[PDB]
């Protein structure tokens, strides 16, 4: 794996010698919880909603209320 | 912002962290020059009242200096006519738990300024470690708005300076060491409204691609790569946070910045090029859509977080054609110069030839040719890899003299051993997965823990160094250059220094109270040129001193590289201001005296 | 100590907090004088890495500066040939619970130095907040011994500097606000052995009286008064701690200090003169036995803790007779001058005529004639009492110019409202029993929170002020005088200043990072005269800022008097060093440069 | 009470108008716990004993052991 052998434009990754093309089911399988994986996005969506409410009230009253 | 452009032309002002939208850190002020810089002495000083690392530097505009601190991120305003009075302060209330999810000290890289219009007066804009972005009335310090831009419960923090362009505030992201997917966000300064938000990984709908994305360089990659260069949903915790700096070209109306490292550090847990981490972006300002994106470090194996400074210039290339450029000294030890309209790769040179993870960057293919002997992988301890994860360059904001056509680079000379380990992702928890041991590189003095810095003067077209100087410790805080023929920078062992812009000769230095991890800045007030700098050591290099650590692999490998810092500096926090002969408003001893 | 006497004659040294055993703070160095002091600017600087109040000042002996900090009381040594290198450090481990029984910030008033002999090498001696006294090897910083001299579980702490005379280390006591009975203790520097310990109240067996105690002034009182001027066992928790300063006369072999306030502040809970609190002592060094004791403030009603600086001089009295004197500016607003051989009262003048608890001190009877209109008592709110509990003078170490025969007094202009309340005593808990509101005095600007300082030059025989100058805030940190005709001092709003010794004209000032509560010091190194000072505001006046308090009666009445400080300073901690034109070892820019 | 009337040398205290000469048994009786009053002496004696032990060992070994 020297980075110069490319599957497609922008995709040149290769497994190192001894390593698998895919790690699912392998010793290196991360076994990520989908529930955990989604928590970031949930947090950001919640903040976006609270910010939007602040913005609407700000437009109405002229003073920011956090 | 048209007004920011005009303000940045005046030596009375330093209106943004990079001084101007091009990030030149270049001053046309010549009062302080090669022949008299030895006469520079402190004019006055100011303690911030907090410790830990003091990154960024003050702003000056409208005859007022604005000063930021590390957590809890207090802001001070000072009228330059009477520097001893605090015109106003802003002291945020934050959950102290925010400290616990900061990988690399509770630093903050500084304020931004929006000059006002007929709908809102001028604003000072700040970020908070706990994720907020806050707009303050510049004159009064009173809150104008406060928005949530990160949630510490999922490992998000903010350490980057906000960036103002036109009427937008742009804020980046931190927490790749906790598996945070990078996101960059713009808010309307008048209303606080979110205008756009784009991510570093995932579907194109998330990443924000212009219809012409990489049209001039399709071999960089175009559609679908934010998922197709990952296995399944690993991109959802895939890093790419942007916590460094931006540049902006008002004519092209594009801004530029780099996205950070993929998560985790354990490369074996994320097969694939991991786009679009480690990428140089050229984005349209109003929509945020990417016009080009060049991935510097496909499938990162080293934490070469691609967030470093962008410096814009216009120079004739090797074919004699005038090019609009960006120049970017990356963590990975390569200095990238791209055409800032097309994204074309112009040059890509090692900032020090000891860099060994890459043989060379092929300018035709755009790919770094990897040396497998210095890669990382599960089941192997990689040794004498250069650069260290800390980089041959980190967050320091450097400078470009447009007359000399030289970039003045504050460089780290650091290498490492590295060994990954398996670990689970849990939101709000660290997600690193490697043990690291960093130390001075081959040109330094590893046994004695020193020689880990360099300062180099660089031409982006020829790739040559005008001069190269060694430094006792990594030069972390950036550089500032002036038409006086001087290059200023601070050091971790507690000096501010000036070197000859043409030869690199050391002309002056002063022993500050504590080490420096921010950049010098300069401004002229009532005819006197001042140079000011933050002091207060911290950030990644000084975690050993700041958090009392001793294990050489502690502090993500930093502790073993910097044990000698504590023999030269302790913690601190303040601003030191310099002038010729220490000339000062308080030379009038009646200034501020009781009863006048 | 003979060697200390000799070392103190040289301008290369500043070997004890008081500069010399007479506590003159007077330098014969003339390089810096009234006509070139405007050329003073910083030479170099040093951050201590801690915040809160920085009292005392550095020591300099044989080419090395020694620096102490507030809690946790770290010690640094620095070779003046290369000020940026820390030669050694000592960082004590203490229970952070010690902080909670400190009444008035976690300050420490500095190091002492014992010059060595054939049985032990030179030693740096320090006190710790948690009550320990530690002797360190001066060359290496390694612990030589460590003794317990206070138990925080019963309210004892240590903030005072140890005092070395002959081969003894003498340490005072703190905690009268928690009912601590004052005790003063001597340890042998060679062995750590306790040589004597004497108390401020209780039976004569505890107080330590020479058979000739007050022989020359029997009307001061002699035997049994440590219990007979109390009701039953109230003396056991009766205060009289000594946390201020000492002076020493080698020829008489006597040392001098004042004992502090009685506990509680509620006067109604302790009827009686409460001896021997509030007392000027002359004690034999080797035995500790008191040769004289004069009680300045019988039955204290105001917390005029009698611990302030002692300054020794030899002057002709009003009858033309040469006298060996001590001069002592008390919290109670009276400047006492006594014959330091006999204890005879020579003069006792108000340091400002607004003092009103006392009409005058009768020199014949020795008694302060009380104005009952400004006393305190249960059931009564006393108004416009001068001085405040904070004193017209507090812990600042002032100066005496022996050629001009003038004392340069750093004074507070503060008065108060006061109302006691009943409370129980519990060991380890506070035992104050008064609500207090302090504010600027009549000559200042109460309504605007300023005009609370003065600097005055005083002749102890005539009682005349050669000059008087107002200061924005209380001058808390003391003063230092030189034969260059200069009086240096630092201010709470963050300046170091120099006034003309003859006229008081302000000649120079520089804006330090933080307010000052310690004294300036000076020393000459390789032919260059340096002036150095601690900065880092705190102690009693700045508790509002340091501990974020807003109630005017909070901080034992101080908060309402110093609300304006925060507009002029934040916390800090460091040493700033000055010289003509900022001349510095680093004028050689190669000094300390890699390599290597 | 002006401080100038003395029942003995060094003892010039007087009760203020309406106040008692002794407060025991009055409304101003502090009613101190005698065992509380003794606690700091006990603490000081304990420290003296521990220091003395350190000093004796120091004389014997030449190295301080806290
Ligand atoms: O991965 C991240 O998102 C994140 C954040 C920071 C930060 O927010 O300060 C750093 C890094 N990464 C990082 O890789 C790094 O080397 C670094 C150095 C520093 C510093 O200021 O000294 N911050 C950060
Ligand atoms: O009663 C005591 O034993 C004790 C201790 C201290 C101290 O230890 O710092 C002060 C006082 N009293 C006191 O009355 C006082 O005004 C004071 C001011 C300060 C200061 O350093 O700013 N300490 C102390
Ligand atoms: Mg990172
Ligand atoms: Mg007291």
Automatic annotation (TrEMBL), chains A, D:
GO terms for biological process: methanol oxidation. Heterotetramer composed of 2 alpha and 2 beta subunits. Belongs to the methanol dehydrogenase subunit 2 family. Disulfide bonds join 6-12. The keyword Signal applies. It is an enzyme of class 1 (oxidoreductase). It comes from Methylophaga aminisulfidivorans MP. Its EC number is 1.1.2.7. GO terms for molecular function: alcohol dehydrogenase (cytochrome c(L)) activity; alcohol dehydrogenase (NAD+) activity. The keyword Signal applies. This is Methanol dehydrogenase [cytochrome c] subunit 2. Keywords: Disulfide bond, Methanol utilization, Oxidoreductase, Signal. It catalyses: 2 Fe(III)-[cytochrome cL] + a primary alcohol = 2 Fe(II)-[cytochrome cL] + an aldehyde + 2 H(+). Catalyzes the oxidation of primary alcohols including methanol.
From TrEMBL, chains B, C:
Residues 14-346, 476-531 form the Pyrrolo-quinoline quinone repeat domain. Belongs to the bacterial PQQ dehydrogenase family. The keyword Oxidoreductase applies. Ca(2+) binds at residues 177, 261, 303. This is Glucose dehydrogenase. Pyrroloquinoline quinone binds at residues 55, 109, 159, 174-176, 241, 243, 331, 394, 476, 540. It comes from the Bacteria. The active site is at 303 (proton acceptor). The keyword Mitochondrion does not apply. Binds 1 PQQ group per subunit. GO terms for cellular component: membrane; outer membrane-bounded periplasmic space. Its cofactor is pyrroloquinoline quinone; Ca(2+). CDD domains: PQQ_MDH. PANTHER family: QUINOPROTEIN ALCOHOL DEHYDROGENASE (CYTOCHROME C), QUINOPROTEIN GLUCOSE DEHYDROGENASE. Disulfide bonds join 103-104, 386-415. Keywords: Calcium, Disulfide bond, Metal-binding, Oxidoreductase, PQQ, Signal. One of its GO terms (molecular function) is calcium ion binding. Mg(2+) binds at residues 177, 261, 303.
């Amino acid at each position: 794996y020297d980075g110069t052998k490319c599957k497609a434009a922008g995709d040149c990754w290769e497994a190192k010698p001894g390593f698998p093309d895919k790690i699912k089911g392998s010793k290196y399988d991360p076994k990520h919880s989908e529930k955990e994986l989604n928590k970031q996005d949930a947090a950001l969506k919640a903040m976006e909603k609270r910010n939007a409410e602040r913005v609407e009230q700000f437009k109405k009253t002229g003073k920011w209320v956090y | 912002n048209d007004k920011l452009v005009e303000l940045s032309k005046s030596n009375e002002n330093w209106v943004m962290q990079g001084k101007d939208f091009s990030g030149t850190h270049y001053s046309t002020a010549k009062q302080i020059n090669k022949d008299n810089v030895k006469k520079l002495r402190p004019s006055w000083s100011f303690s911030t009242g907090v410790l830990n690392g003091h990154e960024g530097a003050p702003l000056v505009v409208n005859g007022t200096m604005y000063i930021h601190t590390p957590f809890p991120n207090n802001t001070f305003a000072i009228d330059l006519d009477e520097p001893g009075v605090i015109k106003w302060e802003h002291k945020p209330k934050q959950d102290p738990a925010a400290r616990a999810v900061a990988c690399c000290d509770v630093v903050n890289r500084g304020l931004a300024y929006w000059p006002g219009d007929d709908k809102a007066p001028a604003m000072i804009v700040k970020s908070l470690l706990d994720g907020h972005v806050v707009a303050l009335n510049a004159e009064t310090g009173e809150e104008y708005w406060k928005v949530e831009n990160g949630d510490i419960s999922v490992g998000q923090t903010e350490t980057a300076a906000p960036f103002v362009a036109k009427d937008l505030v742009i804020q980046g992201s931190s927490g790749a060491e906790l598996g945070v997917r990078g996101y960059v966000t713009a808010y309307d300064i008048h209303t606080g409204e979110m205008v756009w938000r784009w991510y570093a990984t995932g579907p194109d709908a998330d990443v924000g691609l212009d219809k012409d994305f990489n049209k001039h360089n399709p071999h960089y990659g175009q559609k679908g790569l934010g998922t197709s260069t990952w296995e399944d949903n690993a991109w959802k915790i895939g890093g790419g946070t942007n916590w460094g700096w931006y540049a902006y070209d008002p004519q092209l109306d594009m801004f530029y910045y780099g996205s950070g490292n993929p998560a985790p550090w354990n490369e074996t847990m994320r097969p694939g090029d991991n786009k679009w981490t480690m990428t140089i972006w050229g984005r349209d300002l109003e929509t945020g859509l990417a016009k080009f994106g060049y991935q510097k470090t496909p499938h990162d194996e080293w934490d070469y977080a691609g967030v470093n400074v962008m410096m814009l210039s216009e120079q004739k290339d090797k074919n004699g054609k005038m090019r609009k450029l960006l120049t970017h000294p990356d963590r990975n030890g390569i200095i990238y110069t791209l055409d800032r309209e097309t994204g074309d790769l112009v040059s890509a040179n090692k900032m020090d030839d000891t860099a060994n993870w890459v043989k060379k960057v092929d300018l035709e293919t755009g790919l770094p040719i990897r040396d497998p002997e210095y890669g990382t992988r599960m089941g192997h301890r990689s040794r004498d890899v250069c650069p260290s994860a800390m980089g041959f360059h980190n967050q320091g904001f450097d400078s470009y003299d447009p007359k000399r056509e030289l970039f003045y680079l504050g460089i780290n000379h650091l290498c490492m051993d590295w060994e990954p380990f398996m670990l689970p992702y849990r939101a709000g928890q660290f997600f690193v997965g490697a043990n690291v041991w960093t130390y001075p590189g081959p040109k330094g003095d590893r046994q004695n823990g020193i020689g880990s810095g360099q300062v180099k003067a660089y031409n982006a077209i020829t790739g040559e160094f005008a001069w190269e100087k060694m430094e006792k410790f990594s030069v972390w805080g950036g550089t500032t250059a002036t038409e006086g023929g001087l290059v200023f920078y601070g050091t971790l062992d507690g000096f501010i220094k000036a070197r000859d812009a043409d030869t690199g000769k050391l002309l002056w230095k002063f022993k500050l109270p504590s080490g420096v991890i921010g950049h010098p800045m300069t401004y002229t007030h009532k005819g006197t040129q001042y140079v000011a700098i933050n002091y207060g050591v911290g950030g990644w290099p000084a975690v050993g001193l700041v958090f009392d650590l001793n294990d050489p692999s502690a502090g993500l490998g930093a502790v073993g590289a910097f044990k000698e810092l504590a023999k030269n500096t302790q913690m601190g926090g303040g601003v030191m201001v310099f002038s010729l002969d220490g000339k000062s408003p308080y030379d009038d001893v009646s200034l501020g005296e009781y009863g006048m």
